């Protein structure tokens, strides 16, 4: 009984893959997010420990659910005749990176460092759990304004992590790597690092670097905003044309610009309060 436990609220947003509403767990007033996904649009299905057919999204979210709240947590889920309904945790107040950057424009490096670092910890968490996000971007990152913690959301274009090549992709095009645009082939980690490269640029310049396929395959990076030399370096490194030339997650976090990151709470007190 879904409608009995939760109290549906306002429409937080929707797209090709879902409609999301703001609900509250009638049980304890817990704030949650209710995501509706139509069975038709669902492309990938999995099963997880049970042998129960469910959309890959549910599989992935279950594999990454844990104490670590660097990634959104699935509280429960229900299946319906023509759709699946997911109950996600919902922080409040909260704002997504896209809206936040859309209001403050380019972010101070110090803040971008904290945020970027947090995203990296989350993505590492996922890979570690055998999950590849495939759609890392400002829109899929939530900001818990009080604790200054970011959360990865929307594993709708995700997939189990593997070492062999990927031939499918349904994530955001402007965040996809050169190798996808050209050969429609890519490898998880390297493809991820490339989008992390687009994300960082996005944070420090206030907008993405590439808009057209040509710009992506060319990979020439121009900075529209004053950006430190160190940050520019890490950015160009993540956006290297050749996949194998991109940094490992370990190399990114050991990069000079990534040092002395602020604690989440400090970040909130200085940049969010
Ligand atoms: N797709 C998607 C998704 C969202 C979305 C983003 C932009 C526009 C419309 C919907 C939001 C969420 C989402 C939002 C909150 Br406050 C809390 C938990 C969530 O899990 N999940 C998605 O999986």
Swiss-Prot record:
Entry similarity comment: Belongs to the protein kinase superfamily. CAMK Ser/Thr protein kinase family. PIM subfamily.
Known function: Proto-oncogene with serine/threonine kinase activity involved in cell survival and cell proliferation and thus providing a selective advantage in tumorigenesis. Exerts its oncogenic activity through: the regulation of MYC transcriptional activity, the regulation of cell cycle progression and by phosphorylation and inhibition of proapoptotic proteins (BAD, MAP3K5, FOXO3). Phosphorylation of MYC leads to an increase of MYC protein stability and thereby an increase of transcriptional activity.
PANTHER family hit by this protein: SERINE/THREONINE-PROTEIN KINASE PIM, SERINE_THREONINE-PROTEIN KINASE PIM-1
PROSITE patterns cross-referenced by the UniProt entry: PROTEIN_KINASE_ATP, PROTEIN_KINASE_DOM, PROTEIN_KINASE_ST
Binding annotation for ATP: 12-20, 35, 89, 96
InterPro entries: Kinase-like_dom_sf (IPR011009), PIM1/2/3 (IPR017348), PIM_Ser/Thr_kinase (IPR051138), Prot_kinase_dom (IPR000719), Protein_kinase_ATP_BS (IPR017441), Ser/Thr_kinase_AS (IPR008271)
Cofactor(s) needed by this chain: Mg(2+)
Enzymatic reactions: L-seryl-[protein] + ATP = O-phospho-L-seryl-[protein] + ADP + H(+); L-threonyl-[protein] + ATP = O-phospho-L-threonyl-[protein] + ADP + H(+)
Residue ranges of domain Protein kinase in the record: 6-258
Subunit structure and binding partners: Interacts with RP9. Interacts with HSP90AA1, this interaction stabilizes PIM1 protein levels. Interacts (ubiquitinated form) with HSP70 and promotes its proteasomal degradation.
Ribonucleoprotein in keyword set: no
Species lineage: Eukaryota, Metazoa, Chordata, Craniata, Vertebrata
GO cellular component: cytoplasm; cytosol; nucleolus; nucleoplasm; nucleus; plasma membrane
Documented effect of changing residue 161 to F: Decreased kinase activity
Pfam families: Pkinase (PF00069)
Protein name: Serine/threonine-protein kinase pim-1
GO biological process terms held by the UniProt record: apoptotic process; cellular detoxification; cellular response to type II interferon; negative regulation of apoptotic process; negative regulation of DNA-binding transcription factor activity; negative regulation of innate immune response; positive regulation of brown fat cell differentiation; positive regulation of cardiac muscle cell proliferation
Keywords: Apoptosis, ATP-binding, Cell cycle, Cell membrane, Cytoplasm, Host-virus interaction, Kinase, Magnesium, Membrane, Metal-binding, Nucleotide-binding, Nucleus, Phosphoprotein, Proto-oncogene, Serine/threonine-protein kinase, Transferase, Ubl conjugation
């Amino acid at each position: 009984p879904l409608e009995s436990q939760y109290q549906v609220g306002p429409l937080l947003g929707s797209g090709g893959f879902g409609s999301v509403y703001s609900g509250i767990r009638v049980s304890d007033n817990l704030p949650v997010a209710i995501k509706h996904v139509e069975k038709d649009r669902i492309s990938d299905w999995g099963e997880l420990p049970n042998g129960t057919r469910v959309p890959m999204e549910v599989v992935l979210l279950k594999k990454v659910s844990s104490g670590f709240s660097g990634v959104i947590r699935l509280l429960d889920w229900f299946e319906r005749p023509d759709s699946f309904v997911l109950i996600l945790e919902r922080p409040e107040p909260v704002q997504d990176l896209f809206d936040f950057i859309t209001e403050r424009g380019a972010l101070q490096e110090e803040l971008a460092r904290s945020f970027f670092w947090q995203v990296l910890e989350a993505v590492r968490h996922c890979h570690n759990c055998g999950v590849l996000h495939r759609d890392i971007k400002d829109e899929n990152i939530l900001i818990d304004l009080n604790r200054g913690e970011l959360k990865l959301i929307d594993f709708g274009s995700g997939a189990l992590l593997k070492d062999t090549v990927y031939t499918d992709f349904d994530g955001t095009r402007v965040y996809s790597p050169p190798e996808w645009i050209r050969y429609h082939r890519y490898h998880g980690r390297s493809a991820a690092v490339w989008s992390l490269g687009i994300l960082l640029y996005d944070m420090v310049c206030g907008d993405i670097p590439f808009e057209h396929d040509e710009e992506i395959i060319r990979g020439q990076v121009f900075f529209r905003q004053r950006v430190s030399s160190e940050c520019q370096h890490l950015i160009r490194w993540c956006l290297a044309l050749r996949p194998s030339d991109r940094p490992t997650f370990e190399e990114i976090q050991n990069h000079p610009w990534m040092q002395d990151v602020l604690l989440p709470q400090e970040t909130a007190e200085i940049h969010l309060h």
